[PDB]
C-alpha cells in the first residue's frame, strides 16, 4: 500500500551512466552509443525493489501483470560441525582436570631429615564449562493469508517449504557463528598465543613468510617434550599432529595456493601441517588464522526440539526450534593465533596456581608466566587486593597471609606496557581464601 | 570456601567483545548481532 | 559504495514500532558511522539511532 | 651468514653441511672436526643433524 516510490531507493550513483557520460562521451563508453534503448535499461535494469502497477503502453487501464515467479532457495551448512563432541543429557557443567609436571629438587641428604613426610601438593588445573546457549527460533506460517500472493499451487508449496528451511538454515548459521565467536572471544581476552606472521624481518623474497611460520609453529606444537607456552594455563601439553586443525581465512589460503603451491615441485614440503578448514575470515582485527587441537573445542549439545502449535483464531502455525548447547573452549589445549597487524607486547599474564586456601599466618609461593610478543622481558609487580596491613606479597611472588584476616584475597601480577598516559597494565589475577587460625590471641614481646 | 568472585578472573583484554558487538553498527561484527545468547557465550565460553 | 537498509518495506501499525538494520559496504578496512533519520513523520515518530 | 637472511644464505648453509658431512664421513678421517684433534672418522648413519 505505497506511493511516490522513486525506483532509485538504495541507489548511490557513483556516476550517472547516461547524463554524466554516455550522452557526452568522446571516450571508452563509445560502444553503447549504437544502442538506442540504453536509457530504458539504465532506468530499471538493476532490479526494482517495490512493485508498481504499470499500465499498458497501448491501452491504458490494462495492468501489466507479473508473468513469472521464480523462488530462490538456498541451503546453508555449518562447516564446523566436525568440532562438536556430542550430546550432554543430564548435567549442566563439565569438569576438566589437568595434572602437569613438577619441578625437580636437588638431591640433598642433609635437608632430608625433616622433610620425609613433607607434603608437596600436585599442580592441578581445573576448568569448568557451563551450558551457554539456550535459544529458540520462531517462525509463523499464516497458511491462509499467503494464498493472496500466489496464483499457483506449486509456488505455494515452493514457498512454504522455504520457510521450513529458513529455520534449518538459521540454526545452522548461528551454529557456525557461535563457534566463530569463541575464537574472537578468546583472542579479545588475550587468551590466544599470539604469533605474528606478516612481520618479515628478512629482506626481499618474503612471499613464503607466512608459510615458514605456520609450518614451524605447527611443528613446535608437537615436540614430544611438549611446551609451556601455547596454552593459556601455562601447562606442559603436547599435540600429536593428527589432531591439529587450522581454521584459516579464505584470503590466506590463496596466498598459500598461488605464491607457494604453484612453483612447488614437491607440495608435501610446503602444505600447511594438519587439517585445513577455510572460513571467510575472523571478526578480530589482524587475526588471519588459528591453529588448534581437536580438544580445544568443548562444544556440546543438550536439546534439539522442533515444536509447533496452531492458532485457530489467527489461522496460523508457530514453529519453535529450540537449540540448547554448551559452547566452550579448552584452556588446556594449544591454540595459536597467526596475526598480522600491530599487537600489544604482553597479551596474557598467568599467575600460577590460580586459587589457594592458605591458613592465617601461612604463606604461598606464586609464579607469573608472561605471554609476551617480542621479548622485552617485562618486569612483574605483585600485589594483594582486599587485605589488611598485615598481608603483603614480595619479590618473586611469595604471599604472606597475616594472622588477622579472613578475607578472600586477589593476588595480582602487574605488567606495564604503557607509558605516560593512562598506561597499559596487563594484570593477571589469582584468588586466595583464608582458613582461620586459633593463633593464641593478644600481643607479643 | 570461595563465596563471591567475578567470572572474568585474571583476564586482561585488549578489546571488549560486548562493546565491540553492540557499539559497532559499522562492520566486522554485524554477524554477531543476530545472536541472542551472545553474552553468555562471550563472557563464559573461555571457561 | 552502498548502504543497504535491510527490510526495505515496512507496514508498521499506528503506534507500534519496527527494527531496521543497515549494512555498510566498506571497501577498505575501516568502520563508518551510521546516522538514522526519519523524514515525513508527524511530531514524534523518531528513530533512535541503531 | 644467517639462515633467515635471504634464500642465498639458506642455500649456502645447505652447501656447507653437505660439504661437512662428506668431510666427516670420508674414510681417511681428519684431525679436523673434533676437540682432541684425534684422527677419527664417522659414518653417515651415525651423523645426526
Amino acid at each position: 500500500t505505497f506511493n511516490d516510490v522513486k525506483t532509485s531507493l538504495g541507489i548511490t550513483e557513483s556516476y550517472d551512466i547516461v547524463n554524466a557520460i554516455r550522452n557526452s562521451q568522446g571516450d571508452n563508453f563509445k560502444s553503447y552509443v549504437p544502442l538506442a534503448t540504453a536509457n530504458n535499461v539504465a532506468e530499471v535494469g538493476a532490479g526494482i525493489l517495490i512493485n508498481q502497477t504499470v499500465q499498458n503502453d497501448f491501452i491504458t487501464s490494462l495492468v501489466d501483470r507479473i508473468g513469472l515467479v521464480v523462488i530462490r532457495q538456498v541451503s546453508l551448512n555449518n562447516p564446523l560441525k566436525k568440532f562438536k563432541k556430542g550430546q550432554i543429557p543430564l548435567g549442566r557443567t563439565i569438569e576438566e582436570i589437568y595434572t602437569d609436571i613438577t619441578k625437580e629438587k636437588q638431591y640433598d641428604a642433609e635437608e632430608a631429615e625433616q622433610k620425609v613426610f613433607e607434603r608437596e601438593m600436585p599442580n592441578v588445573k581445573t576448568l569448568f564449562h557451563e551450558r551457554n546457549r539456550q535459544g529458540f527460533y520462531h517462525q509463523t506460517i499464516q497458511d491462509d493469508s499467503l494464498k493472496t500472493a500466489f496464483v499457483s499451487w506449486g509456488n505455494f508449496e515452493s514457498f512454504v517449504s522455504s520457510i521450513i528451511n529458513a529455520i534449518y538454515n538459521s540454526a545452522e548459521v548461528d551454529e557456525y557463528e557461535y563457534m566463530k565467536l569463541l575464537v574472537d572471544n578468546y583472542y579479545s581476552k588475550g587468551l590466544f598465543t599470539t604469533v605474528k606472521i606478516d612481520e618479515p624481518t628478512s629482506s626481499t623474497g618474503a612471499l613464503t613468510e607466512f608459510v615458514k611460520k605456520m609450518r614451524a609453529t605447527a611443528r613446535k606444537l608437537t615436540l614430544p617434550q611438549g611446551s609451556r607456552d601455547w596454552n593459556s594455563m601455562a601447562v606442559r601439553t603436547r599435540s600429536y599432529m593428527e589432531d591439529l586443525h587450522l581454521i584459516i581465512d579464505a584470503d590466506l589460503e590463496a596466498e598459500l595456493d598461488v605464491d607457494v603451491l604453484a612453483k612447488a615441485f614437491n607440495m608435501n614440503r610446503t602444505d600447511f601441517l594438519g587439517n585445513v578448514t577455510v572460513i571467510d575470515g575472523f571478526a578480530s582485527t589482524g587475526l588471519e588464522a588459528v591453529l588448534v587441537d581437536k580438544d580445544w573445542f568443548m562444544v556440546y549439545d543438550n536439546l534439539h526440539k522442533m515444536e509447533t502449535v496452531r492458532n485457530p483464531r489467527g489461522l496460523y502455525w508457530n514453529y519453535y526450534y529450540h537449540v540448547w548447547q554448551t559452547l566452550s573452549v579448552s584452556r588446556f589445549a594449544n591454540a595459536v593465533a597467526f596475526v598480522s597487524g600491530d599487537v600489544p607486547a604482553v597479551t596474557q599474564v598467568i599467575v600460577s596456581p590460580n586459587i589457594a586456601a592458605v591458613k592465617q599466618g601461612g604463606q604461598q609461593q606464586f609464579t607469573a608466566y608472561v605471554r609476551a610478543t617480542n621479548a622485552k622481558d617485562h618486569k612483574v609487580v605483585w600485589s594483594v587486593e582486599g587485605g589488611s596491613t598485615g598481608t603483603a606479597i614480595t619479590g618473586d611472588g611469595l604471599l604472606s597471609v597475616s594472622g588477622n584476616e579472613d578475607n578472600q584475597l586477589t593476588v595480582k601480577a602487574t605488567v606495564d606496557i604503557g607509558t605516560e598516559d593512562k598506561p597499559k597494565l596487563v594484570v593477571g589475577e589469582a584468588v586466595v581464601s583464608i582458613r582461620p587460625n586459633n593463633a593464641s590471641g593478644g600481643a607479643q614481646a
Side-chain angles (χ1 to χ4, degrees), chain A:
Chain A
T1 314
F2 286 145
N3 50 357
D4 200 0
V5 172
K6 299 288 186 181
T7 308
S8 298
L9 294 175
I11 297 303
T12 302
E13 291 177 351
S14 63
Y15 67 100
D16 195 357
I17 185 175
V18 183
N19 288 323
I21 290 180
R22 182 183 172 271
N23 296 323
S24 177
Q25 294 167 356
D27 60 4
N28 203 4
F29 284 83
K30 65 181 181 180
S31 67
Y32 301 115
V33 166
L35 307 178
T37 73
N39 295 324
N40 297 320
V41 177
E43 184 68 27
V44 292
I48 302 165
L49 288 176
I50 295 170
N51 198 6
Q52 290 289 321
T53 301
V54 178
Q55 304 299 322
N56 198 351
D57 284 335
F58 173 56
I59 294 175
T60 66
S61 69
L62 288 184
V63 174
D64 278 335
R65 292 195 67 91
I66 304 171
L68 179 63
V69 176
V70 300
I71 296 171
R72 305 295 190 185
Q73 186 175 358
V74 78
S75 179
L76 305 168
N77 286 316
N78 192 2
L80 307 179
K81 190 179 179 180
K82 65 177 179 184
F83 291 156
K84 295 177 72 175
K85 293 177 175 64
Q87 183 183 1
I88 297 177
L90 299 175
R92 184 179 182 274
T93 58
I94 306 167
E95 185 178 2
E96 197 174 6
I97 302 168
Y98 187 66
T99 74
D100 62 337
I101 63 172
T102 188
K103 187 175 181 180
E104 76 174 5
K105 294 286 183 66
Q106 189 177 8
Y107 175 69
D108 193 0
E110 182 179 0
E111 293 179 354
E113 298 184 353
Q114 291 82 11
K115 299 185 185 295
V116 187
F117 301 101
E118 190 191 7
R119 183 180 62 178
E120 284 181 350
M121 62 176 288
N123 286 320
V124 169
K125 302 287 189 291
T126 53
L127 195 69
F128 285 127
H129 306 291
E130 291 182 352
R131 180 183 69 184
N132 298 321
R133 183 192 177 183
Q134 195 176 4
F136 67 105
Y137 284 101
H138 190 195
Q139 201 77 41
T140 315
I141 301 173
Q142 294 189 0
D143 279 325
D144 289 330
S145 65
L146 288 176
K147 295 183 181 178
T148 281
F150 293 135
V151 303
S152 179
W153 302 100
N155 288 320
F156 185 74
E157 285 89 3
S158 296
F159 180 71
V160 166
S161 302
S162 72
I163 310 166
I164 300 303
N165 299 315
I167 288 171
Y168 292 108
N169 288 320
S170 303
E172 202 72 26
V173 159
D174 285 334
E175 191 186 4
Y176 166 76
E177 203 74 33
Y178 273 113
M179 304 177 71
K180 193 181 174 182
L181 181 60
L182 296 168
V183 183
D184 300 329
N185 192 10
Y186 201 73
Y187 182 75
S188 59
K189 304 302 187 184
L191 290 174
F192 263 139
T193 304
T194 296
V195 171
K196 298 173 187 181
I197 55 170
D198 290 330
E199 295 293 326
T201 62
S202 176
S203 175
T204 64
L207 292 177
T208 73
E209 296 297 3
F210 74 106
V211 169
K212 292 196 294 183
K213 293 187 182 293
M214 293 171 69
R215 187 174 172 83
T217 308
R219 182 63 61 86
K220 289 182 185 177
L221 295 174
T222 56
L223 293 173
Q225 67 271 16
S227 181
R228 179 75 65 194
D229 53 354
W230 304 110
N231 304 310
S232 67
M233 306 298 286
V235 292
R236 184 74 73 97
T237 63
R238 188 191 174 187
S239 180
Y240 278 161
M241 184 64 80
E242 294 178 351
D243 297 332
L244 285 179
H245 301 292
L246 180 52
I247 297 169
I248 185 173
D249 191 357
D251 282 335
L252 191 66
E253 178 67 28
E255 299 290 329
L256 169 71
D257 203 73
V258 168
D259 292 333
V260 177
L261 288 176
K263 302 177 288 184
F265 300 148
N266 298 314
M267 284 184 284
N268 287 320
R269 295 293 179 186
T270 43
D271 290 329
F272 281 148
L273 292 174
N275 301 317
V276 179
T277 300
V278 173
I279 63 165
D280 49 351
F282 298 96
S284 300
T285 302
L287 179 67
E288 301 297 326
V290 163
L291 171 57
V292 287
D293 291 336
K294 192 172 182 176
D295 287 332
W296 187 71
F297 289 101
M298 297 294 293
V299 181
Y300 287 93
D301 290 331
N302 299 313
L303 274 178
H304 292 287
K305 276 190 174 180
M306 177 65 78
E307 293 294 329
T308 179
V309 72
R310 171 72 177 178
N311 196 352
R313 191 186 184 90
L315 288 169
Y316 54 86
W317 295 93
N318 284 327
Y319 283 156
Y320 293 101
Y321 188 62
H322 298 272
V323 174
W324 296 1
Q325 278 190 351
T326 308
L327 290 165
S328 184
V329 168
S330 177
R331 291 179 70 186
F332 296 146
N334 296 324
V336 182
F338 296 134
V339 305
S340 64
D342 304 338
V343 299
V346 173
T347 60
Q348 194 183 359
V349 174
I350 303 166
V351 185
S352 56
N354 283 317
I355 51 170
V358 183
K359 189 174 182 180
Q360 292 170 356
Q363 67 192 0
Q364 178 66 42
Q365 178 60 47
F366 285 137
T367 307
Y369 295 95
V370 170
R371 288 283 189 270
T373 55
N374 292 320
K376 294 178 182 180
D377 191 21
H378 296 279
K379 184 177 179 179
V380 177
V381 172
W382 294 94
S383 178
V384 174
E385 181 180 1
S388 72
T389 51
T391 292
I393 188 169
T394 185
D396 198 2
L398 185 59
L399 179 61
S400 175
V401 172
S402 173
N404 290 318
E405 290 186 359
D406 45 353
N407 291 321
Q408 191 174 7
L409 300 180
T410 299
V411 177
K412 292 183 177 177
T414 304
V415 167
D416 198 4
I417 305 171
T419 184
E420 306 295 322
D421 202 356
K422 301 293 181 182
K424 187 65 68 176
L425 298 179
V426 181
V427 173
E429 294 175 355
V431 173
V432 178
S433 75
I434 287 171
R435 293 179 292 171
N437 192 1
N438 191 2
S440 73
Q444 66 181 2

